[PDB]
Amino acid sequence: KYIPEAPRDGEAYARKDGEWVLLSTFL
Amino acid sequence: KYIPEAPRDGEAYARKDGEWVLLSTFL
Amino acid sequence: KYIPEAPRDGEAYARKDGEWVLLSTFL
């Protein structure tokens, strides 16, 4: 598939297992 | 809606508020 | 110029040079 827009919520996101997950967590 | 291709410039981006932002800007 | 899904392998991904790169490359 193609990837949809990430949340519109002030936060940056990486992509993991077909979903948007916060970057802050991994960092 | 869907995300577009990110810039092509040798650096890595994440997805935020409907734009591609540098990873270094968070690290 | 929609971008296809990242590999399904449990890893966080950032977009770079028209490809998916592992977040941990830079961590």
Considering only residues 1 to 27 of chain C, which have any Cβ-Cβ distance to chain B shorter than 8 Å?
1-3, 14-18, 21, 23, 25-27
* Interchain pair C23, A14: CB under 8 A: yes
Assign C4 to helix, strand or coil. strand
**Cα distance between residue A8 and residue C11, in whole Å:** 22
**Cα distance between residue C13 and residue C27, in whole Å:** 12
**Resolution limit in angstroms?**
1.0
Q: Using DSSP bridges, classify how beta strands A19-22 and A12-16 pair: parallel, antiparallel or unpaired.
A: antiparallel
Q: Residues 6 or more apart from A12 whose CB is under 8 A from it? A: A22, A23, A24, B14, B15, B16, B21, B26
Assign C5 to helix, strand or coil. coil
Distance from the C22 Cα atom to the nearest Cα atom in chain B, whole angstroms: 10
Please say whether the beta carbons of B15 and B3 come within 8 A: yes
Q: With helix as H, strand as E and coil as C, how does A1-27 read?
A: CECECCCCCCCEEEEECCEEEEHHHHC
Q: How many CB pairs under 8 A join A and B?
A: 39
